[PDB]
Amino acid sequence: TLSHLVDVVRRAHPDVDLEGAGVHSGQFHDVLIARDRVFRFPKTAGAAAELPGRVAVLTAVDAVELGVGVPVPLSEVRDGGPHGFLVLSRLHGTPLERGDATSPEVIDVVAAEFARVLRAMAGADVEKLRLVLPVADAGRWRGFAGRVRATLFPLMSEDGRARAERELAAAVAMDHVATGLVHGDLGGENVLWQQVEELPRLTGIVDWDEAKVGDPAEDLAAVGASYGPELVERVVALLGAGDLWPRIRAYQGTFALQQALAGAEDGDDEELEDGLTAYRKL
Q: What positions carry a catalytic annotation?
A: 185
Q: 18 or 31: whose CB is closer to ligand ATP?
A: 31
By beta-carbon distance, which residue lies closest to ligand ATP? Answer: 71
Q: Is 118 in the site for ligand ATP (CB under 6 A)?
A: no
Q: Please choose, out of 4-12, 131-139, 167-175, 206-214, the segment that lies near ligand ATP by the rule CB under 6 A.
A: 206-214
Which C-beta is closer to ligand ATP: that of 32 or that of 221?
Answer: 32
Helix (H) or strand (E) holding 223: helix 216-227
> Looking at 77-85, 86-94, 217-225, 229-237, which segment touches ligand ATP (CB under 6 A)?
86-94
| CB nearer to ligand ATP: pick between 102 and 190 | 190
Beta partners for 61? none
Q: Tell me: does residue 93 bind ligand ATP (CB under 6 A).
A: no
Using CB under 6 A as the binding rule, whether residue 275 contacts ligand ATP is answered as no
Whole-number minimum distance, CB 26 to ligand ATP, in Å?
Answer: 5
Q: Is 25 in contact with 2 (CB distance < 8 Å)?
A: yes
Residue list, annotated binding site for ATP: 40, 89, 91
- Enumerate residues 6-25 that contact ligand ATP by CB under 6 A: 24
| Residue 68 is a binding residue for ligand ATP (CB under 6 A) | no
Q: What is the DSSP string of 53-113?
A: HHHHHHHHHHHH--SSB---BSS--BS-TTT-BEEEEPPP-BPPPHHHHHSTTTHHHHHHH
Report the Cα 135 to chain-centroid distance in Å: 15
Question: What is the Cα–Cα distance from 54 to 209, expressed in whole angstroms?
Answer: 7
Helix (H, G, I), strand (E, B) or coil at 280: coil
Q: For residue 97, what are the CA distances in angstroms to 59, 111, 165?
A: 29, 14, 32
**Residue 71 in the binding site for ligand ATP (CB under 6 A):** yes
User: Is 173 a residue that touches ligand ATP (CB under 6 A)?
Assistant: no
| Residue closer to ligand ATP (CB basis): 23 or 199 | 23
Contact residue for ligand ATP among 5, 38, 250, 257 (CB under 6 A): 38
Cα 74 → chain centroid: 22
Q: How far is the CB of 29 from ligand ATP (least distance, A)?
A: 6
Q: Is 96 in the site for ligand ATP (CB under 6 A)?
A: no
Which residues in the 211-230 window bind ligand ATP by CB under 6 A?
none
CA 168 and chain centroid, separation: 21
The CA distance from 17 to 195, in Å, is 26
Binding residue (CB under 6 A) for ligand ATP from 43, 78, 90, 163: 90
Q: Is the dihedral of CA 194, 197, 200, 202 positive or negative?
A: negative
186 near ligand ATP, judged by CB under 6 A: no
> Residues in the chain, how many?
282
Indicate whether 207 belongs to the interface with ligand ATP (CB under 6 A). yes
CA dihedral 88, 89, 90, 93 (to 10 degrees): -140
Contact residues: ligand ATP, CB under 6 A: 24, 26, 31, 33, 38, 71, 88-91, 190, 206-207, 209
